[PDB]
Write a protein that binds this ligand. Structure first.
Ligand SMILES: *C(=O)[C@@H]([C@@H]1N=C(C(=O)O)[C@@H](S[C@@H]2CN[C@H](C(=O)N(C)C)C2)[C@@H]1C)[C@@H](C)O
Ligand SMILES: *C(=O)[C@@H]([C@@H]1N=C(C(=O)O)[C@@H](S[C@@H]2CN[C@H](C(=O)N(C)C)C2)[C@@H]1C)[C@@H](C)O
Ligand SMILES: *C(=O)[C@@H]([C@@H]1N=C(C(=O)O)[C@@H](S[C@@H]2CN[C@H](C(=O)N(C)C)C2)[C@@H]1C)[C@@H](C)O
Lengths: 694, 693, 144, 35
């Protein structure tokens, strides 16, 4: 029923989610009490305006020592418009905002109830648009609180036509090609570091960055003598950087004036996410030591500023380190992650099918889990300051909620007491659980023996139909968090099975390395085995099983409907991968095809018959003639990681054989299809297809 | 020096001002403490973006029930865009917002979520919503289930005689709709709209008399009906903005049925009704004469259950003690009732100050809460559960925000103010107040003994001076923060602002002294004040200049025409030049008749005697005598004073070969309030004054 | 178009004869062009096979397509080259030229690339046409 | 010049040409309606 489905979607889409949080300075009262404020930013879908709106809210926390005595709200939510970046000063007395208005870009400095200063960046004409993404962008205050540091596109020389008319620039360079950094990085070619002096209002572009690197993620060095940044190599050409952690890069330090630049780490691996300690004596960062897979287990490393000694705090985990930790799989650290003693660090990471919070001692190297035990759930740490943490928590049947806590002293971190600031209303008609799967003897890996995998099952609280979902990646995973579409399906009477096959993140490096060279054979059989086991155990209706997946999840779904034509009654895919060989020459990450096919990648390659045959043998198109399941295809015309002609080839093959297919094309969307209108339309169409065909 | 002047303007225009404030619900703690939040909205000029920006801030107040124990900030300022109106619910748990994004949306917020949103344009039940302070409003039901507002009435669809249809009234596309005048473009006939939150349905109430425009509505006790104010618009509309002499009445209408009843008299002006917390009585302001555009008003009370009307505060001829001189505000605070439903609080001009007053509605006594001292300007933003929020400022101190508790009856003068947000003073400006007594030959025939006042700013002889008369003529200057006078003072000038006889805040006799004497009594008062100030402070008599706008420009032209040897320069903005020609083109024709000394009739026809009097009272008659260099700045879209008056004056002066500089702003109204236009005009005026003296 | 295909073949197979080259929208890899062009039967026919709407990938056919494409000779090239691509072309996708450009750039051969974001195969708009002709003339007069 | 044409009838009373086929109207699942 379209009306009931629309009402249910309206009801479910109203739940908001957190995006950022920060803490204010301490305040004392004549009575002796102590309190501080918390600033939080939320985002929410709006179907009437058909847009994502962002608003701000503030809370108050009264504490006595290292304990929370009271917490409450401090006003209503306020909607905001045009904010790209914002950062409070170290002392908490000023605030810096990057805004777009008019459009033009402005940099604003606020203090109390006044906008102290504003700078029109476009008019000054020292650089191009400012970077606001999480890959390169940043905005940092000096320790003297007198200068600001950010990153912006490099200025290009003026060009003009050969036939311009002048009143009574390089000619012919208007259409010169500038290579950008790939998907969701349109028009971004070469960033540069910019320093603004607040008092005088003059802008400078730092000199000394190596010509062959793109800089980013910069912060002020101790004493404000220079700048520390991360440089990514872009020779001979750029490879897609978004959602990948295997791009070669290094850590550099550059003086404010003079042009001297020095290397602070190795130059053959990937490094990211540096964070200077509160005492300004050491730096912690993440290091990935191989460039092959797009996601893997990483190391946590420490660098001493005054002795210049580097060490490994946390190393790779092959299978598991105890029952609570399995390695580091996050691509970033919180902006504030140091404890007040400048000896411990806190972060969050996936752990099997959960997402947990961990504390690491950088002197001894021990890892402690702060949220071990229980049924599950997903945690996210937004910030920590003076040993006060702010976190978000959610589960598959409980939308996001906000909490604060105090980090206990060393050796007792597991006794943390959480206090609620903003709770969410649960949905008692959804029940979720976790299942463990052991592959049969004939499916064991030749070199990695004994691996098992997992699935997450949602069901209402042989009659029930089921929908099966494999995740993309293939080096990604599902966690027990709030997901809109699975919740909607569960509330419409379906059962939902989300599969984390071998090769997912959060199960050790062996699982990561078992999959490459076996795509299309091992993961497909893992999914099929999980489906059969669940059907035999729970006794669902075997005649009403359906599939739904995107990107690599669509590739798996096509493989499954091609190799087991009698198991599934319907299928929905989004931007699937169909032909690896033809994909190699048009994608922004060509190394992915070579790596997943089972070969090494190198620039200056050439087409070879053997490699091309190997790629062709692993593609779902090979099974196209056997398919008879009805299919719904949804494509985004401006997707750059997976071109939309793969789905077109599959569609033509199916159409030539008189198979029922329904195709939708969105002419301005990328791989995500994340626009509110497009997202709602696609979800409604998929739900109607599933309901009608089962 | 243009660079120094630009730097000084940049520095001065950075100070923000308050616009609105509201209070949140009370919160208790396990320790026994009690605190509540204060929400405030500020506005500020931005020269880089060339626009007025609006932001919000929040504060916390910890109290012990009858006194303030602590106050502090609760975060940073947050900028907002597109908010037209907003109102918190009676219980403080929900918030309603009207936004533009273009379309118009009515929204409802609760904690960290945008609960509901309604697209008004798509529903197609009415036109654009009214957001002004004359008609607009936004009110919650006592059950917190319905919302009430005002919107333009829907017009039937029309089309051309020659439209092509696929294989509405014809000829009505260009029918004339009369609007309400200056700063009321396209607003012709409002209607009352009720929205049901739960179901989403909009209804337009029935029963409003066909010959009135409704506004300022609120829910009646028990949610049975609606109380509103209706303004007569037959046979045609007269300019309503900045005037309190438009005929109107108070009405009550049932939710369903169409029965409408009158609650007050129908021959005078009424405004600003406010229902008491206990829901038993209503106070409002009543003006009993339609002649002058501003005057002294009465405060009246109506009992809901006995149906008895009474006069709480009556007209003051000259003065009632040394602290009160009458009621001259055009509106009351949205929240103005004491917690006991027996006292009311408001703010009003008092001579050259602006003070806060408390009135007992049972006995009728008026008590001043801010009496004594050097002076200053106060403004009351709200009161709730006997907690008041106020703004304070002076000529040398930008606006500041304070809170306080209203003492029990009989001791209101002992109120203790606690500072929430302070401003940095400017110690190089010094201000004082001068009292002036007209000489025997200038006494009024019927009102004898009146005196007037002036405000003098100076740096803290060879000091030049600038003289400013206010518009109106029924208006006045108060000792508050003024940007341009402060900028002039910081450049080395002395500034004299004159409140001549006829200004507000000096009694009804002063109001009624001026009509029929414009161009004679107001011109000689200013000249006498200038002469008196010159001989006492020993300023430089050869470097005196004039600056004024609207009626202030009319006075300045009169002065340079009748005393050609006193002033060295002059700057005027949208001046009145020829009353007779003005009558036929302005949106307030009654003003010309009233100020000339005659009564106004909607059926009046041109006459020789009235026209002769108007011509005799106009400054153009003295044009041939003028020899002072003049700078004239005009807004092309001004509707209260058409820009052809200045053009006629300019043509005469140009034909006589006098130095004149004319600036025309093609998209501005009488105020010239846009940031770019305002800055340009101020810089040009400052440069003219500095160069010519 | 097919004339740029021939030029790339010639500079790859006879590295001594020519001293400059300009190409607009060349065919570079017949095998990868089949899945993106609007006339897929052209690839089949010009390679020596019969087109069919039901045909699926067959490694034997894909071997012939690769052996007849100029990319095979990329490592032997030394002549300076100027490429002018139109981004909206639907018969010859513009990634074809990008592959050749990347291969040449990885070996430090002098290359100049111009990209017209709103032009089709013809580059027929007056501004684009004039700019391309001027650039080609300047290249030829400078490198000879 | 592949499909387009414009032709007169011999009687010179009618004209003939070619045009794109009409497509049925569509709308979103969440469109607000005039009450
Ligand atoms: C498809 O799977 C292709 C790529 N792999 C992906 C993955 O990791 O799942 C996606 S991007 C990643 C998934 N969800 C996030 C997202 O889409 N946004 C934040 C917009 C990030 C990517 C297309 C794969 C075949 O290469
Ligand atoms: C000029 O004086 C004409 C009218 N009288 C005025 C007055 O009261 O001073 C002005 S409107 C009034 C003055 N300042 C406020 C303002 O201008 N804005 C809020 C924009 C209100 C009006 C033009 C007079 C000759 O009729
Ligand atoms: C390139 O050669 C590709 C196609 N073959 C064509 C040809 O016949 O030359 C061109 S279209 C043809 C050439 N000039 C005319 C033209 O382009 N216009 C009038 C716009 C017609 C086409 C790109 C070939 C590889 O298929």
């Amino acid at each position: 029923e379209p009306e009931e489905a629309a009402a249910l979607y309206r009801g479910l889409s109203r739940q908001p989610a957190l995006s950022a949080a920060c803490l204010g300075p301490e305040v004392t009262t004549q009575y002796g009490g102590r309190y501080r404020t918390v600033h939080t930013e939320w985002t929410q879908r709006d179907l009437e305006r058909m847009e994502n709106i962002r608003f701000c809210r503030q809370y108050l926390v009264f504490h006595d020592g290292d304990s929370v005595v009271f917490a409450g709200p401090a006003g209503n939510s306020v909607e905001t418009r045009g904010e790209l970046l914002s950062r409070e000063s170290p002392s908490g007395t000023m605030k810096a905002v990057l805004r777009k208005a008019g459009e033009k870009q402005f940099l604003e400095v606020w203090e109390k109830n006044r906008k102290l200063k504003s700078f029109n960046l476009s008019a000054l004409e020292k650089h191009g648009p400012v970077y606001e993404d999480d890959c390169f962008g940043c905005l940092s205050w000096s320790h003297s609180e007198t200068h600001l540091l950010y990153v912006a596109d490099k200025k290009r020389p003026k060009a003009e036509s050969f036939f311009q008319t002048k009143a009574l620039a390089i000619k012919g360079d208007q259409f010169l090609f500038y290579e950008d950094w790939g998907e969701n990085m349109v028009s971004k070619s070469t960033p540069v570091l910019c320093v603004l002096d607040i008092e005088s209002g003059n802008i400078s572009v730092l000199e000394g960055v190596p010509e062959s690197v793109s800089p980013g993620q910069a912060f002020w060095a101790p004493g404000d003598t220079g700048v520390v940044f991360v440089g990514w190599w872009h020779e001979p050409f750029r490879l897609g950087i978004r959602f990948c952690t295997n791009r070669r890069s290094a850590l550099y330090y550059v003086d404010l004036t003079g042009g001297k630049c020095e290397l602070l780490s190795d130059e053959s691996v990937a490094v990211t996410s540096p964070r200077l300690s509160p005492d300004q004596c050491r730096i912690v960062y993440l290091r990935f030591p191989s460039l092959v897979p797009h996601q893997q287990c990483g190391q946590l490393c420490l660098y001493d500023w005054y002795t210049r000694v580097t060490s490994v705090v946390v190393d790779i985990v092959p299978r598991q380190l105890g029952e609570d930790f399995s390695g580091i799989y996050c691509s970033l650290l919180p902006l504030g992650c140091w404890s007040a003693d400048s000896q411990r660090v806190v972060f969050d990471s996936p752990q099997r099918s959960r997402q947990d919070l961990f504390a690491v001692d950088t002197q001894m190297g021990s890892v402690t889990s702060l949220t071990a035990g229980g049924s599950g759930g997903s945690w996210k740490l937004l910030t920590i300051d003076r040993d006060l943490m702010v976190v978000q928590f959610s589960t598959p049947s409980v939308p996001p909620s906000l909490k604060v806590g105090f980090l206990p002293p060393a050796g007792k971190e597991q006794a943390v007491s959480w206090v609620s600031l903003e709770e969410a209303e649960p949905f008692p008609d959804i029940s979720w659980s976790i299942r463990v799967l052991q592959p049969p003897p004939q499916q064991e890996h030749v070199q990695y023996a004994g691996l098992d995998f997992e699935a997450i099952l949602l069901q209402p609280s042989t009659q029930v139909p089921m929908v099966v979902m494999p995740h993309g990646g293939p080096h990604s995973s599902f966690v027990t968090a709030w997901m809109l579409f699975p919740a909607m399906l569960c509330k419409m009477g379906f059962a939902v099975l989300l599969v984390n096959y071998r090769g997912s993140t959060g199960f050790g490096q062996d699982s990561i390395l078992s999959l490459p060279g076996n795509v299309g054979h091992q993961d497909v059989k893992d999914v099929q085995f999980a489906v059969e086991q669940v059907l035999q155990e729970e006794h669902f209706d075997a005649g009403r099983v359906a599939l739904m997946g995107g990107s690599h999840g669509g590739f798996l779904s096509c493989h499954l409907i091609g190799q087991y034509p009698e198991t599934y009654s319907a299928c929905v895919v989004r931007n699937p991968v169909i032909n690896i060989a033809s994909m190699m020459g048009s994608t922004d990450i060509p190394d992915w095809c070579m790596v997943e096919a089972g070969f090494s990648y190198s620039s200056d390659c050439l087409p070879d018959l053997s490699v091309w045959a190997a790629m062709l043998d692993k593609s779902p198109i090979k099974y196209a003639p056997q398919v008879k399941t009805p299919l719904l295809l949804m494509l985004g015309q401006e997707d750059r990681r997976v071109p939309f002609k793969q789905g077109m080839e599959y569609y033509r093959v199916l159409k030539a054989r008189n198979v029922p297919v329904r195709l939708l094309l969105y002419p301005k969307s990328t791989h995500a299809l994340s626009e509110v209108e497009v997202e709602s339309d696609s979800f409604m169409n998929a739900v109607l297809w599933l309901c009608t065909h089962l």
